[PDB]
A paper describes a structure:
Bile salt hydrolases (BSHs) catalyze the amino acid deconjugation reactions required to liberate free bile acids for subsequent and successive modifications and metabolism. The BSHs belong to the N-terminal nucleophile hydrolase (Ntn-hydrolase) superfamily, which is characterized by an αββα core structure that is subject to autoactivation. Here, we identify and describe the BSH from a common member of the Plains bison microbiome, Arthrobacter citreus (BSHAc). Steady-state kinetic analyses demonstrated that BSHAc is a broad-spectrum hydrolase with a preference for glycine-conjugates and deoxycholic acid (DCA).
To better understand the interactions between BSHAc and AAA-10, we crystallized the enzyme after soaking it with the inhibitor for 18 h in 0.1 M MES, pH 6.0 at room temperature. X-ray diffraction data were collected that resulted in the refinement of 1.6 Å resolution model showing a covalent adduct. Structural characterization of BSHAc reacted with AAA-10 showed covalent modification of the N-terminal cysteine nucleophile, providing molecular details for an enzyme-stabilized product formed from this mechanism-based inhibitor’s α-fluoromethyl ketone warhead. The inhibitor was modeled at full occupancy with the BSH oxyanion hole accommodating the product’s ketone oxygen atom. C12 of the LCA-based AAA-10 was notably solvent-exposed and a series of polar and non-polar interactions appear to stabilize the inhibitor structure. Specifically, Trp22, Phe26, and the nearby Tyr136 shift to accommodate the inhibitor, enclosing it from solvent. Finally, two of the C3-sulfate oxygens interact with the backbone amides of Ile132 and Ser139, and a series of water molecules are also present in the inhibitor-occupied active site. The position of the atoms in the SB loop differs significantly between unbound and AAA-10 bound BSHAc models. While the apparent flexibility of this loop allows for the C3-SO4 group of AAA-10 to bind, there is clear displacement of residues that are likely to have roles in stabilizing a substrate. Accordingly, this SB loop of BSHAc may impede rather than accommodate inhibitor binding.
Residue numbers in the entry:
A (entry chain B): 2 to 321
B (entry chain A): 2 to 319
The structure:
Amino acid sequence: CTGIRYSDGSGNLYLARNLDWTSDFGERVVVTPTGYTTKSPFGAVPAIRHAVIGMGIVQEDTPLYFDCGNDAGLAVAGLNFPGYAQYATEAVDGATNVAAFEFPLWVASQFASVDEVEAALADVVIVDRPINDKYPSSLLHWIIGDSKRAIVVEYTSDGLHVFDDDVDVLANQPGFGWHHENLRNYLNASPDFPEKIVLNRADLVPFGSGSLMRGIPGDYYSPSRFVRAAYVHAHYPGKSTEEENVSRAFHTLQQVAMVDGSAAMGSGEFEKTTYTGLFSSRTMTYYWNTYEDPAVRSVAMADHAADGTELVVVLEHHHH
Amino acid sequence: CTGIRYSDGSGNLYLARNLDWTSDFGERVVVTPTGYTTKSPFGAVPAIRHAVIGMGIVQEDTPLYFDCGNDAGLAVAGLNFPGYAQYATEAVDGATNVAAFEFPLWVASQFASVDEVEAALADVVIVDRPINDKYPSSLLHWIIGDSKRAIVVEYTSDGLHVFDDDVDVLANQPGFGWHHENLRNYLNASPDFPEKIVLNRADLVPFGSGSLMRGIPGDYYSPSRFVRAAYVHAHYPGKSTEEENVSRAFHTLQQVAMVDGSAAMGSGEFEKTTYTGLFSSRTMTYYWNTYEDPAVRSVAMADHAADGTELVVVLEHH
Ligand SMILES: *CC(=O)CC[C@@H](C)[C@H]1CC[C@H]2[C@@H]3CC[C@@H]4C[C@H](OS(=O)(=O)O)CC[C@]4(C)[C@H]3CC[C@]12C
Ligand SMILES: *CC(=O)CC[C@@H](C)[C@H]1CC[C@H]2[C@@H]3CC[C@@H]4C[C@H](OS(=O)(=O)O)CC[C@]4(C)[C@H]3CC[C@]12C
Ligand SMILES: [Cl-]
Ligand SMILES: [Mg+2]
Ligand SMILES: [Mg+2]
Ligand SMILES: [Mg+2]
Ligand SMILES: [Mg+2]
Ligand SMILES: [Mg+2]
C-alpha cells in the first residue's frame, strides 16, 4: 500500500491510497454520522463530532476504516507495518487510550485539523484491543492530513512517534525515519531534459524524456515505492480544479500500483492493487476504482444521513 | 510510447499501446472498410482486403493510423524512432513501395497473419513521402502481431530489418537489438518471495513483496520502459476471458505510463500518457482510456459497415 496527501492551493484536502493485497476484503464505503452511539473501549471516541466517510467494514456495530475523511477537511489512512508496529498491551490511566481498530475513527470523528490531532497525540496510547478474533490483530501505521500538511503516526516497541511528513507520502515498513533518510540516496533524480553531456570526448544526448530520472526504482518493494511515490508526488504540478485533482490521485497511485504476476507474497500469491481510494474535502466525496474496473466511482457525503443515528453502509454510487 | 502483444491461448489477439506525448493529437477511432477507394502513392495499397479499426487521424481522405487491427486478427502500432529511422527518399522501381504514413494501413489492410506480412516485407521499401505539409515527417518503427507472435520492423540507414519480438513489447530508441541485449542486464529480477537470506552472519528477510524485483528501473527513459514492460508483461498470468484480458492491457501499460511532472522534453513540457488503446480480435473491438478519464471506452467494428465505401470517424461509443 502507498498513500499520498496534497492540496489545491485553495484550502482543499486530497488524501488517497492504494490497497495492495492478495485478495479483497469486502470493503464498502461507510458513513459514520454525528448521531451514532459510539462503542469506544476506553472512551477515546465518546461521540461523533465530525461526520466521517471512507472505505472499510462494519463489525460489532463499529466502523473499521481502512482510510477516511471527515466533514471538517481532515483525513487518515492506515497501512500495514508488521515487524515494526507494536501497540501497548493495556490502557494507561490518564492517557487518551485508543484501540488500534478505532484509530482512524478517532482521528476523523474528533478533530478538524492536523494541529488539533497532533496536540491530542501528546497523550495518546494505542492499545492492542482487538475488535474480535475474526482477523489477525492489526499491525498498522497511519498517515494523517489536512489541506496544510501531513503527519505520520508509528507506535512501536518504544512508544509513540509522530513525524512531519514533508514528502506527503507513506508506504509500508521500515519506519518513517528510515525512508526519509533513504531519500538522500536519490539526489540526482530529476525530470529535467539535458541537451548535451560530454563524457571524455563522447557527445551524449538523451534518447528522449527521463534521462535524469535514472535511478528511481521500479520494483514493488516498500522502500522502492516510498522513493518512487515521493518523486512522482513531489513533481506533479499543482492543480486548481476538482477534476484535475481527482485525476492527479489516480495517476500518481497508478505509478506505484501492483499488477498481477510481478511480485509474490510468501504464500506464492501475487500482490495487486485491489482498490485505489481518494477523499476530497472540496466536494466531501469519496472516489475509488478497482483492479477489475478503472472507471472512477464516487459517493458524496451530502447524499447520506450524516446527521443520522446509524452507520450507513453505502450501496449506491455515482459515475459507473 | 510502449506497446505490447499477447493472446489468450485460444487464438485471440490483444495488441495495446500508450501514446505518450506533451500534447494531445486529436486522434479518433477510424474504421477503414473493405469498400474504401484507396489513395496509395505507389500502389502498395490498391484495395482494402481486410477491414481495419484503430486510433488515428484522417487527412486527404486517407486514414493515418497510430495503431490498428483488422478483421483477420493482425494488428500493428507505430512508435517514435527519430535518430534511427531513415526512410528511402524515392520509390524503387520493382519494389513494394510503401509510404511511411500508410505503413500500418498496408499491414492491416492487406494481410491476415504475421507469416504473410513477414513474407511480403522481403520486397518492401518504406518511402519518405509525406501525406501533406502539416506535420513534421514521421520517424517511426512498428510492432506487428497476431495471436501467434510479434515482429518489430525498423527501417534505418541499414535498410529494413525484421526482428523476432520474443518479449512481445516495444518502446522507442535505440534499435530493437540494443534493447534485446539489454535484457541480459536484469537476469536477477524475479517476482519470487525469498523466505530468508544469510549475508555473512546477518539473517535477512524481505520487508514484503518485490524484494527480488530490485533492479527493475522505474524511470521514463525508453530503455527503462522496455525493460520494465518486458518484465511485467512476461510475468502477467495468461487469462482466458475478454474482461480479464482487457484489464491485463490497461494494468500492464499503467506500469510504464507517464504522468504529469515526472519527465520533461526539450521544450520543458512534461510527457504524459495521453491515451491507452487496445485492439481485441476476439470481439473485433478497440478499447481505450485517456489521461483525463480512466474509464474504458470501446468501439465495436460490427457496429459500423465494415464493407462500406467511406472511412468512418467514430463519435458514438461505449
Ligand atoms: C497494503 C497494506 O498496507 C495492507 C493493509 C491492509 C491489509 C489493512 C489496512 C487496514 C486494515 C483493517 C483495519 C480495520 C480492522 C482492524 C482489525 O484489527 S483488530 O481490531 O486488531 O482485530 C483487523 C481487521 C481490519 C478490517 C483490518 C484488516 C487489515 C487492513 C485492511
Ligand atoms: C510516444 C511515441 O512514440 C510518439 C509517437 C507519435 C508522436 C506518432 C505515432 C504515430 C504518428 C502519426 C502517424 C500518422 C501520420 C504520419 C505523418 O507522416 S508524414 O506523412 O511523413 O507526414 C505525420 C503525422 C501522423 C499523424 C503521425 C504523427 C506522429 C504520431 C502520432
Ligand atoms: Cl521459491
Ligand atoms: Mg474488490
Ligand atoms: Mg521518446
Ligand atoms: Mg485526448
Ligand atoms: Mg485507384
Ligand atoms: Mg463481404
